[PDB]
Amino acid sequence: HMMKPAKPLPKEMEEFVQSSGENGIVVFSLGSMISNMSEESANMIASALAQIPQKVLWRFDGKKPNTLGSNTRLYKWLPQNDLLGHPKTKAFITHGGTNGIYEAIYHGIPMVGIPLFADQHDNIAHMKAKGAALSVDIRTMSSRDLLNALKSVINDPVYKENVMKLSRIHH
């Protein structure tokens, strides 16, 4: 692995991240297929995210979900790598592209994959077998299923321990 250092966040974004206190944050990025899917999918995701105490930064560019939580901010662009390096970061939600999984690995951030394409399926299945991720299919699963996965990856420290083992293979 090359090193993948983080820089500081934009000022307004750092302030939102700090507002999470001891709860910390969840980064959902890029989420690049969500806006080609139904309004319903986005609402189901938004419902799940609204039920955790963490603040959530969601890279998103569609219509605002009607079930958006007050804990969740929507951003057309994010500095994903900088967020993943932030000490407040507890979990990463991603479709499961290679680039963003390399960054999760480097920064030691466990994952909830929302895979759609073959390579994402494969990548997330590999992270899952390593103990570093859980997965949901947003086309078949419920808001509750995603919520349960989030709570697990956020709070059970063994997921983070398992992803940090992968950077030391890589280190």
Can you list the domains of the chain with their CATH numbers? 1-171 (3.40.50.2000)
State the angle between helix axes of 39-49 and 143-155 in degrees (0 to 180), rounded to the nearest 10.
40
Give the chain's largest Cα–Cα span. Answer: 43
What burial letters (b/e) apply to 43-80, b meaning 16+ CB within 10 Å? bbbbbbbbebebbbbbbbeeeebebbbebbebeeebbb
Q: Which residues contact 22 (CB under 8 A, 6 or more apart)?
A: none
Q: How far apart are the first and last CA of the chain?
A: 7
- Give strand pairing partners of 73: 57
Kindly list the distances between the CA atom of residue 20 and the CA atoms of 32, 40, 122, 147, 157, in Å, as whole numbers in the listed order.
Answer: 25, 27, 33, 18, 19
- Method for this entry: X-ray
